[PDB]
RNA sequence: GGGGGGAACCUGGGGAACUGAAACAUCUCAGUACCCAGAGGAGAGGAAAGAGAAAUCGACUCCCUGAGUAGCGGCGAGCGA
RNA sequence: CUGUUGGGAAGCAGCGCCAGAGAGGGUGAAAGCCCCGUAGGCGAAAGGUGGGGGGAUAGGUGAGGGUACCCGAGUACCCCGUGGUUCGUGGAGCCAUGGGGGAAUCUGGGCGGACCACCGCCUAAGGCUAAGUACUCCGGGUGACCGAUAGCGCACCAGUACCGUGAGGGAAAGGUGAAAAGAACCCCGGGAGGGGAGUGAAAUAGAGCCUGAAACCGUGGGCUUACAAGCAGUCACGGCCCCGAGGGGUUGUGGCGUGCCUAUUGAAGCAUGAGCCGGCGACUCACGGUCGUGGGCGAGCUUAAGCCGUUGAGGCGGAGGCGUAGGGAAACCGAGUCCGAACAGGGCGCAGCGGCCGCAAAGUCCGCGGCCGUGGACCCGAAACCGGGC
RNA sequence: GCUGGGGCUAGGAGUGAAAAGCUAACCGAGCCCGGAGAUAGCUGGUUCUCCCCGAAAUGACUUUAGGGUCAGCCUCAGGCG
RNA sequence: GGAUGACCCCAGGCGGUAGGGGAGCGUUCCCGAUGCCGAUGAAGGCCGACCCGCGAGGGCGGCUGGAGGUAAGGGAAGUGC
RNA sequence: ACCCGGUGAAAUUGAACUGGCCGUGAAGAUGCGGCCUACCCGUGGCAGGACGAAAAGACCCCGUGGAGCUUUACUGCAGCC
């Protein structure tokens, strides 16, 4: 049916193990089928690029590697703590994500 | 006592025997069986019960005797099993085909019979027959029968 | 392999 | 028998929960020490006269 | 399966208390003519089967 | 309304042989394998012209038991309420 | 949550916390508290179901007294030929029915094992009827189930490739790494392939990718061999090379020496089988029996199907079975009985250890073991027979 | 007479100027699937180690003779001594 | 002998096919296990002239391997070529 | 056919370090004994031996195996009276 993001593209969050343990950047992508995000300036390797159009002198290109989604949490806007997801019902009848540490919302 | 102390006692679970398991086993190649005989084979050989090579068993030569029976089949008659006084000494009071069915002494559906091996008791005793020992024994003994039918 | 050719005759030791 | 009382001890690895109509032997073993209800202890008692 | 009884068995033997099989003696179902009395007479008695066929027949009765 | 299909299961119409009997024909294998028809989520059966000895029971189906008993049988191998 | 080793922590250390949740799977290694879950709850506009709860409808229901009107016809019934039943012609009933004959309407008819009488049971020749029973294409749960020669034929684009005119037959083939970061660019080369550079913790993890055995092929080195007779080794001593009063490798001379298996009276045998290596490969299971054995109980022992509980908890259930008495074809009698006229003879039968309590035991229930019967029953192999199709 | 195309006849059956010839590269009874893991008293094969004992190739009977039943001979347990 | 494998002493037996009997090794799996061994390196591989065992085997050490394995005591079998 | 360049099978195969004679041996020995002979490895040729290869001997016997055929063998069935 779908598979469980607790993570959504353009919240911040925080790699909470691996070499980038302890890194914090805004989600740049979500890969739902792979179960994967890409963190901005996280899990950087190098690539070899053949001389071509786009890429003349060839040579290698910075780019940023998936992330398994299990390895992230997301930063509260709030408390500004790491945190697990909550769902909260508005009285609209909505649901939306809130963090557990203090109480707000994440959308 | 814990699980790992959970012990079956010397001798009450032996190993099997596995023939055709190689030659320090004694048991091995032809795993116990000899040489190349009918037995030797899978199937082996006739009922040993009763087979002979071929000749007329010695069953078979043997004559038969009395009423085998014919269709259709058995002929519903009462049926009687005896219980010696011996068998009594264990009731005070009375006795009765309902109840020594309770004791294990006369099976169901049979019809209860007195017989002489042992002491008789000063007990009321029901039953359908009366040996003619049983029936001295107990009035010599201060019992009381009662024919029942 | 599925087809066998026949195997010679013997010969006749009668 | 008390449910509320298997219910709080169910989850702690060093405690295996039963009723009284399910005392075995094999739990009993299994076990350093036992404990019962005194209304359990009467079940116990009954299963063995 | 459970064994079946044999009935020539059961038809031609019975089961002492102890255990041994008895049978009817053979050889007077005919040509009586000339034979003694004292050979009918023997022969209308039971006798007990040698113990290694006894004990082949008592297979044979599994529920006796 | 029918027609055709559906893995097994079900009922009906037909129906072998190897094999076993240390040969073989009655007997066995077996009303099995299989062919055909029909049916359905089940089918079959079913409300006594019953059972069978109890002066008794109370439709049918299915399980346990009765029982390898009663019996059947070149009274053989076996078959079997 | 933090620190620490580490490519990586979930490992280790320190201080905590949840638990009606410590089933399980993931995440860079080994996580209750990171992820997916789990316990515990919640949920349908629409379709399907609805054996439960409710309502409705169809439907249902008295006595005597008279009367003798009806009560299932090519039927019952008899006979001939068969089938079904445990019943194979048997003393052969019953139920069925192809052929002939052929009724009656309760004072009628059928049955209780030929037949007759008596006492009884039941009302044929129209139909329908849930539930408890069977099965598994299908969905889900769970294994003292398999783990790529296993498990389905198929983990993979398999009822395919391929074989066959056709019915039909019928495979093989899984795995880089945490992540493609899947090797830019340079060098030799037509390419293929390689050498550098670069990535990675690791590149004999480089895609012909985890581990990477053996047969088998090669390169390098130590010892050795061109006057020598050999189931190839073994024992001895000596030489050389290696490792540090010893050991390993090699083998020059001397001694001794007829492969393995199978079958056989007897094989090195010129009798069988085997090129060599890897993997697959043959005494089991169920029910019954018979001994033995470890226990429980013991003139007693034991439950089956089921029912309740559990959700890897157990209990109920005594129907029934084995044993407590044997003898006889049986009637029958019974510690006796059978043959017999017999009080005759004979056959088959009958009767714990201590100090009222204890040990033990008839027996029986369960476990285990050997062996037996029934099944394919230790595994592989016919030539054939039969059925339905092509 | 030979030959193309279109057709009919088949498994105890066809067809045969007759050879038991031919019926899809082996026909004294086609092929496939099934019964089926037919049956095989025959041949072959039967997998770790150690310790104790240790046979027989005879008799009788057998549609039996290279297979069996009983006995003889081996082994284990318990008893007697 | 000491006191019922606690080790010692003396004496004797110990060729072996069919076959009987005894005691053991190892493989897969279950309980022991919410445990314990494990990246300071699991299983598997390759060596070893070392240690234990009569033997089947078990250790230990080095290399390889890179994520599993599993004790004492028992339980069950698709168990050794 | 032979030599050089290119491509490159096969049945078979216990392993082999695979000689003669006279003996021996399960009765026809490269493999055992005693002698005799014999430096190491190939290439083209011949076919005496390796009881050479191939095909689990068709003959023969054995099996209470099979199949075709026959008849005044047995017992049935069709068909016909
Ligand atoms: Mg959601
Ligand atoms: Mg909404
Ligand atoms: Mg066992
Ligand atoms: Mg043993
Ligand atoms: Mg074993
Ligand atoms: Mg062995
Ligand atoms: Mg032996
Ligand atoms: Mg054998
Ligand atoms: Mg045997
Ligand atoms: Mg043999
Ligand atoms: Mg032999
Ligand atoms: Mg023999
Ligand atoms: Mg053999
Ligand atoms: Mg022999
Ligand atoms: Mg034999
Ligand atoms: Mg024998
Ligand atoms: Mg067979
Ligand atoms: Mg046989
Ligand atoms: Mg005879
Ligand atoms: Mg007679
Ligand atoms: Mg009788
Ligand atoms: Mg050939
Ligand atoms: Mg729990
Ligand atoms: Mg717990
Ligand atoms: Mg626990
Ligand atoms: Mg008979
Ligand atoms: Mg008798
Ligand atoms: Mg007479
Ligand atoms: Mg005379
Ligand atoms: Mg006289
Ligand atoms: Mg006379
Ligand atoms: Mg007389
Ligand atoms: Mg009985
Ligand atoms: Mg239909
Ligand atoms: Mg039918
Ligand atoms: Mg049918
Ligand atoms: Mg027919
Ligand atoms: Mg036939
Ligand atoms: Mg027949
Ligand atoms: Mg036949
Ligand atoms: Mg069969
Ligand atoms: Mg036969
Ligand atoms: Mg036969
Ligand atoms: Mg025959
Ligand atoms: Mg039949
Ligand atoms: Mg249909
Ligand atoms: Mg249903
Ligand atoms: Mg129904
Ligand atoms: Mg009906
Ligand atoms: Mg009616
Ligand atoms: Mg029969
Ligand atoms: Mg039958
Ligand atoms: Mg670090
Ligand atoms: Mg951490
Ligand atoms: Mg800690
Ligand atoms: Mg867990
Ligand atoms: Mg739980
Ligand atoms: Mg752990
Ligand atoms: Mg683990
Ligand atoms: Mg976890
Ligand atoms: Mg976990
Ligand atoms: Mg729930
Ligand atoms: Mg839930
Ligand atoms: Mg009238
Ligand atoms: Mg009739
Ligand atoms: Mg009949
Ligand atoms: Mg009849
Ligand atoms: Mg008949
Ligand atoms: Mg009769
Ligand atoms: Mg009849
Ligand atoms: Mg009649
Ligand atoms: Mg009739
Ligand atoms: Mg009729
Ligand atoms: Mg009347
Ligand atoms: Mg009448
Ligand atoms: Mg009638
Ligand atoms: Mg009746
Ligand atoms: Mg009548
Ligand atoms: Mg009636
Ligand atoms: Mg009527
Ligand atoms: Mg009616
Ligand atoms: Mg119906
Ligand atoms: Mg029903
Ligand atoms: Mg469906
Ligand atoms: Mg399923
Ligand atoms: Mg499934
Ligand atoms: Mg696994
Ligand atoms: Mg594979
Ligand atoms: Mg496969
Ligand atoms: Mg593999
Ligand atoms: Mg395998
Ligand atoms: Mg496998
Ligand atoms: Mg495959
Ligand atoms: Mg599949
Ligand atoms: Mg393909
Ligand atoms: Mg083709
Ligand atoms: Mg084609
Ligand atoms: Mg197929
Ligand atoms: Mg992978
Ligand atoms: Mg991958
Ligand atoms: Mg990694
Ligand atoms: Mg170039
Ligand atoms: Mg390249
Ligand atoms: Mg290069
Ligand atoms: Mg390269
Ligand atoms: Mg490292
Ligand atoms: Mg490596
Ligand atoms: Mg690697
Ligand atoms: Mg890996
Ligand atoms: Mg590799
Ligand atoms: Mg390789
Ligand atoms: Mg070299
Ligand atoms: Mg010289
Ligand atoms: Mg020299
Ligand atoms: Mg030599
Ligand atoms: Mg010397
Ligand atoms: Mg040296
Ligand atoms: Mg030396
Ligand atoms: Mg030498
Ligand atoms: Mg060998
Ligand atoms: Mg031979
Ligand atoms: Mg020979
Ligand atoms: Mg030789
Ligand atoms: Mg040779
Ligand atoms: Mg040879
Ligand atoms: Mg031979
Ligand atoms: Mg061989
Ligand atoms: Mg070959
Ligand atoms: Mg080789
Ligand atoms: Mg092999
Ligand atoms: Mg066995
Ligand atoms: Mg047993
Ligand atoms: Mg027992
Ligand atoms: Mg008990
Ligand atoms: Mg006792
Ligand atoms: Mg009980
Ligand atoms: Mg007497
Ligand atoms: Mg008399
Ligand atoms: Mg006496
Ligand atoms: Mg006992
Ligand atoms: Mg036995
Ligand atoms: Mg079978
Ligand atoms: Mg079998
Ligand atoms: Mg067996
Ligand atoms: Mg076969
Ligand atoms: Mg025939
Ligand atoms: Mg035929
Ligand atoms: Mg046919
Ligand atoms: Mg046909
Ligand atoms: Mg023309
Ligand atoms: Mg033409
Ligand atoms: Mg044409
Ligand atoms: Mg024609
Ligand atoms: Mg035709
Ligand atoms: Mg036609
Ligand atoms: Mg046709
Ligand atoms: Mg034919
Ligand atoms: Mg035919
Ligand atoms: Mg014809
Ligand atoms: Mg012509
Ligand atoms: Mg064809
Ligand atoms: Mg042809
Ligand atoms: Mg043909
Ligand atoms: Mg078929
Ligand atoms: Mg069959
Ligand atoms: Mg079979
Ligand atoms: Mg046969
Ligand atoms: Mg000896
Ligand atoms: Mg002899
Ligand atoms: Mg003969
Ligand atoms: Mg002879
Ligand atoms: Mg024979
Ligand atoms: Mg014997
Ligand atoms: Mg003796
Ligand atoms: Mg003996
Ligand atoms: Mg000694
Ligand atoms: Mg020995
Ligand atoms: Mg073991
Ligand atoms: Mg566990
Ligand atoms: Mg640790
Ligand atoms: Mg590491
Ligand atoms: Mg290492
Ligand atoms: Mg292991
Ligand atoms: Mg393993
Ligand atoms: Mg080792
Ligand atoms: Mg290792
Ligand atoms: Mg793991
Ligand atoms: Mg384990
Ligand atoms: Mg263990
Ligand atoms: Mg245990
Ligand atoms: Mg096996
Ligand atoms: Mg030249
Ligand atoms: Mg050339
Ligand atoms: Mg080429
Ligand atoms: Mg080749
Ligand atoms: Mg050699
Ligand atoms: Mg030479
Ligand atoms: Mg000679
Ligand atoms: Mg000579
Ligand atoms: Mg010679
Ligand atoms: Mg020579
Ligand atoms: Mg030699
Ligand atoms: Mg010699
Ligand atoms: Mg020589
Ligand atoms: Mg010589
Ligand atoms: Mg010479
Ligand atoms: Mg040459
Ligand atoms: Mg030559
Ligand atoms: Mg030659
Ligand atoms: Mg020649
Ligand atoms: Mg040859
Ligand atoms: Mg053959
Ligand atoms: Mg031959
Ligand atoms: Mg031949
Ligand atoms: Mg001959
Ligand atoms: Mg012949
Ligand atoms: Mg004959
Ligand atoms: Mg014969
Ligand atoms: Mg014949
Ligand atoms: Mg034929
Ligand atoms: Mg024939
Ligand atoms: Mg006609
Ligand atoms: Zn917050």
Known sequence: MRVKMHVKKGDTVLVASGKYKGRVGKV??????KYAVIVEG???????????????????????????????????????KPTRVRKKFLENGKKIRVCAKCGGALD | MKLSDLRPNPGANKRRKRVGRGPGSGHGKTA???????????????????????????????????????????????????????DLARFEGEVTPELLVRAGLLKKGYRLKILGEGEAKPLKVVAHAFSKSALEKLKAAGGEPVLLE | PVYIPQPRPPHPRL | GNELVRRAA?????????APEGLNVYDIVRTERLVMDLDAWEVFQNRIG | PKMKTHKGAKKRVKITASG?????????????????????????????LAKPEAERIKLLLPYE
């Open chain 5, 20 to 48: 041994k099989v008895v049978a009817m003696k053979t050889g007077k179902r005919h040509l009586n003519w000339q034979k003694s009395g004292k050979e009918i007479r023997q022969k209308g008695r039971k006798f007990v």
């Open chain 2, 32 to 86: 116990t069986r000899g040489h190349k005989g009918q037995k030797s084979r899978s199937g082996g050989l006739k009922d040993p019960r009763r087979f002979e090579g071929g000749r007329s068993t010695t069953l078979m030569r043997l004559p038969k005797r009395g009423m085998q029976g014919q269709v259709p089949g058995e002929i519903k008659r009462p049926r009687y099993q005896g219980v010696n006084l011996k």
């Open chain 1, 42 to 80: 996280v899990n950087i390797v190098k690539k070899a690029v053949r001389v071509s159009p786009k890429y003349p002198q060839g040579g290698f290109i910075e780019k940023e590697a998936p992330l398994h989604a299990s390895k992230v949490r997301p930063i509260c806007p709030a408390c500004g």
């Open chain 4, 10 to 18: 169910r989850n702690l690895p060093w405690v295996v929960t039963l």
């Open chain 1, 28 to 33: 740049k992508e979500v890969l739902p089928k």
